[PDB]
Amino acid sequence: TIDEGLYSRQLYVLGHEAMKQMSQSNVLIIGCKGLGVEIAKNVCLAGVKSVTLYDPQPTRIEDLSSQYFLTEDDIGVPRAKVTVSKLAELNQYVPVSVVDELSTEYLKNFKCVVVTETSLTKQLEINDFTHKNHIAYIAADSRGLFGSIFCDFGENFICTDTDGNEPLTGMIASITDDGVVTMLEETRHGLENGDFVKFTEVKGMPGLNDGTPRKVEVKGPYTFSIGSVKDLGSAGYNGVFTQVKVPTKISFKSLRESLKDPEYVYPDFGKMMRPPQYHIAFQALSAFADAHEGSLPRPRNDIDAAEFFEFCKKIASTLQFDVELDEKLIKEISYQARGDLVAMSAFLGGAVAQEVLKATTSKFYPLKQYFYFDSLESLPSSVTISEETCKPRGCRYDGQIAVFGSEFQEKIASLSTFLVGAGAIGCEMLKNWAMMGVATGESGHISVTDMDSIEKSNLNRQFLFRPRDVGKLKSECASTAVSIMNPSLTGKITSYQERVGPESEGIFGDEFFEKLSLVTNALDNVEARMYVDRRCVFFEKPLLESGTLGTKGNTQVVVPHLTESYGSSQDPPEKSFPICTLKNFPNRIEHTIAWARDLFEGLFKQPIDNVNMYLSSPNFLETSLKTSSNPREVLENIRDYLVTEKPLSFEECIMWARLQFDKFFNNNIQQLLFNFPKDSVTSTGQPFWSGPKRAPTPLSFDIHNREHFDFIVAAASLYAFNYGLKSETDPAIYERVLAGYNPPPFAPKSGIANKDKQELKSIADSLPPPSSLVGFRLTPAEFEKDDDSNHHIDFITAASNLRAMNYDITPADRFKTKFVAGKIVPAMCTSTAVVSGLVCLELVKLVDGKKKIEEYKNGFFNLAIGLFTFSDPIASPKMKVNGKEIDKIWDRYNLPDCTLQELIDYFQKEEGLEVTMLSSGVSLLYANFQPPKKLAERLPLKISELVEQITKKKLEPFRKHLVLEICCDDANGEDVEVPFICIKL
Amino acid sequence: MQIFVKTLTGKTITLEVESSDTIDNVKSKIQDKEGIPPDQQRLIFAGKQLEDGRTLSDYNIQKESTLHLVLRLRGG
Amino acid sequence: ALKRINRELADLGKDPPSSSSAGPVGDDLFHWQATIMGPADSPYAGGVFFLSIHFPTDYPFKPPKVNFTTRIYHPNINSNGSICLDILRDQWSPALTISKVLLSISSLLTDPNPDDPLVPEIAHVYKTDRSRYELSAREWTRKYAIG
Ligand SMILES: Nc1ncnc2c1ncn2[C@@H]1O[C@H](COP(=O)(O)OP(=O)(O)OP(=O)(O)O)[C@@H](O)[C@H]1O
Ligand SMILES: [Mg+2]
Ligand SMILES: [Mg+2]
């Protein structure tokens, strides 16, 4: 009973069984500061049964540094009491409660217990109980730029899925007598040693199709081994294999046992000696707090640092830790003890919420057991950081000033950022900026642009939007929400509904970009990313890129004159199937879904567009007769949809749907089998319908069958929508109309001058004149996946399953059909939180203006396996031009609006280079091989005039520059690459 | 020398290389074992992204070293 | 994309393709019109076939869209001009030039592949009645590819 209208994107990550188990699990969260509220928000969005909060501590001003559900009117009220009301709105299916006191025996009501802001003695007391009663325990801590997570799911935790990948399947070519399985031509199985597989449709070895998993021994990218199959047969031909994923048993240790001998998860292999240091440091923090009435070391205090280091020495000696303590790092942990950063809170809260989901679902591999993280490279170095600058000022930014200082706060308050996109990452980024205090100064400003509107499925991971906001613009709602979070942002945010691209350069022009400090992308496609990257390269602005997919994510930083841009690297492209496979020889459900989408377009979109264009353009027929690749098809479509097969009622729509069923599932298959009989052989004597080619069989229409009736209903409804008729859903009318249907006879055809043009003319003049039909239009069908009442996904599912039945392919349901046809990207709130945290940790590096390239980190992670990795950005390549060092990316030529001849002469005299090609946009302004007359015509013209003449379009008034690409050769004739030219108009 | 490559999806790959091999040879081996073109491979060792034209000894990659094969994602 | 396209164009200009001639339409670098000459030892001998090439914005990281404009009676070319060529759908790499694609198309014209066809009826005629296929191909190349 999962509401798929809300959990659409999350179900593609977790699944129905996982969410069913989640909806029966109780989560207790101790602590309601930034980390705790982040965890609780992510858990409420995920969809657990309920959440209970325990935090009786009264609110303080500094708590607002990362707690975005607290306002300055809540000072002196317990944090849980003021947080529960705002948490109860995130998800209506998840109640949120508060308990004023905790007893140990009360812990048995919860599936998972999360602990934050709790001393080590209390943690030991809680874990001693949860461990022996088999309750999942998670403890998280966030101290300045340092973080720690600990997980303990019990001694006998059962994990059913350990990586979150789909089971591997493949088509076999042959299985020898010794179990050597070979894949089809140039096909990789992708298995690893120790995997289990099961076989089906294996011919010659009927014993392998029972369904018993077998061990896999990988012998190469194309073959593997399963053992001895001597008894089952001598050799097997064809068939398919599917991977079997087996449960695993993970055994955890209690906190008391694991303090002495911890097991570390390493977020970075560049610093593998640190986690042992942090293990001692956090325990020393707990001891220090216990010795000072629960007070942490004061910011940048040397006396407290010395005492803390003494505690660290004592703890290290007690635990027999044979590790040499790094004094600088440990004292850094001491200095930032009272730090409370929203970026660290977001990062750790996303990770911890994913761990909670793992505990409640028994899916994905959990952290085992200690995860110590630092982002110490984010500490500013361009400002003074001392005890005087880091002391609290009694403001909401105290938790951040305790780390960065007041001067860096002044630097942050005067940022002028530009955020492209307002989705999940955009909402998280806006929240982080509001908490950090970005753009709250006199010279600060925020600009956010997004052309989309809020939908029901977006509420699952875009926590700034509520159900009342459905149908409104994303950017306006996000700006209002963050102005509520931080009132100082009132009037400092401007929201646009513009798409960023070539068509919006009049709004995001030179004046707009010249005032920015940095650009942050929150997009979901590569085209927009490339466009924004090119704009940032031209204007020399820092760019923050981030992306997510399910549980995976990455973040990249582009720094002018230091690193390469976003477009300097290539990603794997989308997979498109061969046209021959889709047209005639499918063997996967994906092929049939692509075919069904093309059928939908060809039945309800293209003919309607042709009919509408015929009734509008006065010279449509003549242009189409020599422009399109098949004017006969256009004429036939117009005739059929205007006169020949225009329905007058819904019964004619039903009859049309029946005829289309016959056309696409019975007659084309008969024609194909007439061309290639099932007994036919190739040119080499092999059978034709073998391997990837499956012999089809025609379908006979049966009204009682569910798929046939579904196809008829959906097709009739869509046809009626095209003609604006009143559709019906009662099966009685369908069964009555289809009963009296006489199929026209069909016989496959064996085949065996200039009058065709005359026939086309006769067809054209037979059409009614456009003047006779004025104000008459046919409504085309525009594909929409998120609506479950337009019959689009219903039609595609029915057509795909019918074609699968033709070729004996296993049909899919509406869920998978919508996933494949809609190109849906799986999305999670936890991954969004993690990427926003990483991006905001890089943002402070950008604000500080760090110059070295080793101080920046690009991040990659997969939360399903608990993998984190970081790497320095790649430096921009250099080159030698005229014996000078030139940056291949960030350098350009600045020239006035001179003539073409003057530009060529300048490049000859100054750079000693001969210009061979000059282009702008998508036009060739100049080439060395053009005829002399054309050149002599184009030489004495200015660059702006030349561009206007060649492109046949005048430059817009807001256009202030031109970008030219130039290819030139040296004196010896060697081609030398040069940077682009920026002509100033 | 034998090294291990871990993918962002959890797969593990074992490569037989030598300290004098260039990054191009390693990328070609990874392409042979996985089909990923060398221009689309992002290899990370000890917080450094490996670049073409250099050798393994430039990164101090010794035996039983672990590299990470990563990629960028388009959602969000 | 512009620099790569111009480099390919200049390379074509330097060494003539002999049996082919591709160039931009007007001044647009992302729209070419190529010409292919029918092989002598083929039914399409003495024929001129026009192809339209559309370079995507992501060239060379996405394949060019190549479509026949002249009608041709081939088992692997349908009535819309679509060409059943692997290097144009999923085997494309950013290391193949337009000259290589033209050579591949000429090789396809010199000998069809009816075992994995795009037009099953022409493939059936080719496999069963070869002489009728030859006559039909000659008739089509005389009717459309000449003039
Ligand atoms: N060129 C663009 N200019 C501005 N905003 C853009 C552009 N392309 C995409 N966006 C916005 O970027 C955001 C992408 O985030 P996200 O993918 O999570 O949202 P969505 O596309 O609405 O949701 P879903 O893909 O899950 O159905 C969306 O708001 C989308 O409107
Ligand atoms: Mg949307
Ligand atoms: Mg999207």
Residue numbers in the entry:
A (entry chain A): 14 to 765, 780 to 1012
B (entry chain B): 1 to 76
C (entry chain C): 2 to 148
From the paper:
Here we isolate mimics of transient transthiolation intermediates for E1–Ub(T)–E2 and E2–Ub(T)–E3HECT complexes (where T denotes Ub in a thioester or Ub undergoing transthiolation) using a chemical strategy with native enzymes and near-native Ub to capture and visualize a continuum of structures determined by single-particle cryo-electron microscopy. The resulting E2–Ub vinyl thioether adduct was combined with Uba1 (E1) or Pub2HECT (a homologue of the NEDD4 family of E3HECT enzymes) to yield atomically tailored dithioacetal analogues of E1–Ub(T)–E2 and E2–Ub(T)–E3HECT transthiolation intermediates with substitution of the Ub(T) C-terminal Gly76 oxyanion by a cyanomethyl group.
The cyanomethyl group of the linker, which replaces the negatively charged oxygen of the tetrahedral transthiolation intermediate, is positioned next to the N-terminal end of helix 18 of E1 that includes the E1 active site cysteine. Although the local resolution for Ub is lower, it is sufficient to position Ub to reveal a conformational continuum with Ub(T) moving from a position next to the first catalytic cysteine half-domain (FCCH) of E1 to a position adjacent to the E2. Doubly loaded E1 bound to Ub(A) and ATP•Mg2+ is most adept at Ub(T) transfer to E2 but prior biochemical studies have shown that ATP•Mg2+ alone or the Ub(A)-AMP adenylate can also enhance Ub(T) transfer from E1~Ub(T)20.
